[PDB]
Design an enzyme around this catalytic site. Structure first.
Site, PDB file in Angstrom:
ATOM      1  N   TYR A 184       0.730  -1.086   0.062  1.00  0.00           N
ATOM      2  CA  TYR A 184       0.025   0.063   0.155  1.00  0.00           C
ATOM      3  C   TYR A 184       0.815   1.269   0.037  1.00  0.00           C
ATOM      4  CZ  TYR A 184      -3.271   3.600   2.300  1.00  0.00           C
ATOM      5  OH  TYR A 184      -3.883   4.853   2.589  1.00  0.00           O
ATOM      6  N   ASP A 237     -11.958  11.877  -1.773  1.00  0.00           N
ATOM      7  CA  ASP A 237     -12.165  11.440  -0.480  1.00  0.00           C
ATOM      8  C   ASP A 237     -12.065  12.611   0.471  1.00  0.00           C
ATOM      9  OD1 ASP A 237     -11.549   9.110  -1.715  1.00  0.00           O
ATOM     10  OD2 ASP A 237      -9.810   8.699  -0.434  1.00  0.00           O
ATOM     11  N   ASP A 263      -2.439   5.152  -4.228  1.00  0.00           N
ATOM     12  CA  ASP A 263      -3.512   6.335  -4.446  1.00  0.00           C
ATOM     13  C   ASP A 263      -2.378   7.488  -4.936  1.00  0.00           C
ATOM     14  OD1 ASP A 263      -5.961   5.427  -3.934  1.00  0.00           O
ATOM     15  OD2 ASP A 263      -6.108   6.216  -1.771  1.00  0.00           O
ATOM     16  N   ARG A 269     -11.540   9.301  -7.846  1.00  0.00           N
ATOM     17  CA  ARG A 269     -12.414   9.918  -6.695  1.00  0.00           C
ATOM     18  C   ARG A 269     -12.096  11.121  -5.956  1.00  0.00           C
ATOM     19  NH1 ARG A 269      -8.725   5.572  -4.361  1.00  0.00           N
ATOM     20  NH2 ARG A 269      -8.805   6.738  -2.499  1.00  0.00           N
ATOM     21  N   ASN A 283       0.264   5.587  -0.160  1.00  0.00           N
ATOM     22  CA  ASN A 283       0.246   6.902  -0.783  1.00  0.00           C
ATOM     23  C   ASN A 283       1.064   7.640  -1.418  1.00  0.00           C
ATOM     24  OD1 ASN A 283      -1.553   7.097   2.254  1.00  0.00           O
ATOM     25  ND2 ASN A 283      -2.819   7.414   0.349  1.00  0.00           N
TER      26      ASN A 283
HETATM   27  O1  LIG Z   1      -8.356   8.932   1.190  1.00  0.00           O
HETATM   28  C1  LIG Z   1      -7.004   9.906   1.299  1.00  0.00           C
HETATM   29  C2  LIG Z   1      -6.447   9.527   2.751  1.00  0.00           C
HETATM   30  C3  LIG Z   1      -5.388  10.541   3.021  1.00  0.00           C
HETATM   31  C4  LIG Z   1      -4.370  11.005   1.850  1.00  0.00           C
HETATM   32  C5  LIG Z   1      -5.135  11.094   0.550  1.00  0.00           C
HETATM   33  C6  LIG Z   1      -5.859   9.815   0.462  1.00  0.00           C
HETATM   34  O2  LIG Z   1      -6.489   9.691  -0.882  1.00  0.00           O
END
Ligand SMILES: O[C@H]1CCCC[C@@H]1O
Lengths: 149, 144
Positions: free
Chosen positions: A54, A102, A133, A100, A56
């Site tokens: 995973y 968020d 992400d 998306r 970010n």
């Molecule tokens: O869902 C969010 C959580 C915090 C950083 C960006 C991510 O896309």
């Protein structure tokens, strides 16, 4: 806490099926997106294979299911995910993509930010073997007044 | 550009399998031209472009202007697409783009995930998601 409805951006597809999950793997990913608002790392980790990762993308990656769970548990110590709206979902070659917004809220400050994110998911046997992400971190940090990097 | 640890070992993941995917990969190849007038030919009149940390451009004329502005500051030296896929008229590309800031001469390998909307073989939308601060700090240029 009240969270305002995430609006549709101008560029949202004219194709009405763009946000529809059309395969079993896409359906799993939309279920996972729904589960994000649980802020519950133990619930989320059940979606992951043992051999997984995973990231970010503005932050270091986590490899292995234990490390992914630990990273998520750490994230939810600081942030609440209040809403997820997935405008577009697609897939090919064992990867699923989600465009998306968020809604993220920093518990230490009470401030929130709607993050524009494009994410990719790798699945084998209906389990997540990778999740990355992509988004801009500085925008989030400035908006919620909490440095993360 | 190195292969990321998480990149698919199946080379099919990075290969185009549809006409729209083929176009997007042709477009990625063309980016190294650093030529907005050439690149704009890939876009529909009804279109948009956004590097997500920066303001969007709507309409083909505005997209051309934004591309021209970008190429006055940056060269794209290489694009490597690890993963490509598509559904419902949208194509997604997980890539590394090598960018070079002309004022400083410094280069950076940017991790980017992008989405392309196509109608009749022309681009009606292109949005690239990445972290801008990392690029800025690597090439010593305060872009935003
Ligand atoms: O869902 C969010 C959580 C915090 C950083 C960006 C991510 O896309």
């Amino acid at each position: 806490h009240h969270t305002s409805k995430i609006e549709q951006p101008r560029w949202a597809s004219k194709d009405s099926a763009a946000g529809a999950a059309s395969t079993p793997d896409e359906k799993i990913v939309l279920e996972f997106m729904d589960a994000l608002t649980s802020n519950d790392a133990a619930k989320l980790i059940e979606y992951f294979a043992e051999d997984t990762m995973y990231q970010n993308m503005p932050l270091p990656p986590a490899y292995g299911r234990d490390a992914v769970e630990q990273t998520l548990a750490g994230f939810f110590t600081v942030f609440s995910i209040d809403a997820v709206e997935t405008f577009h979902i697609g897939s090919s070659n064992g990867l699923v993509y989600t465009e998306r917004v968020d809604v993220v809220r920093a518990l230490p400050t009470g401030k929130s930010y709607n993050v524009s994110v494009l994410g990719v998911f790798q699945l084998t046997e209906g389990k997540i073997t990778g999740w990355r992400d992509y988004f801009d971190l500085r925008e989030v940090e400035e908006a919620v007044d909490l440095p993360v990097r």
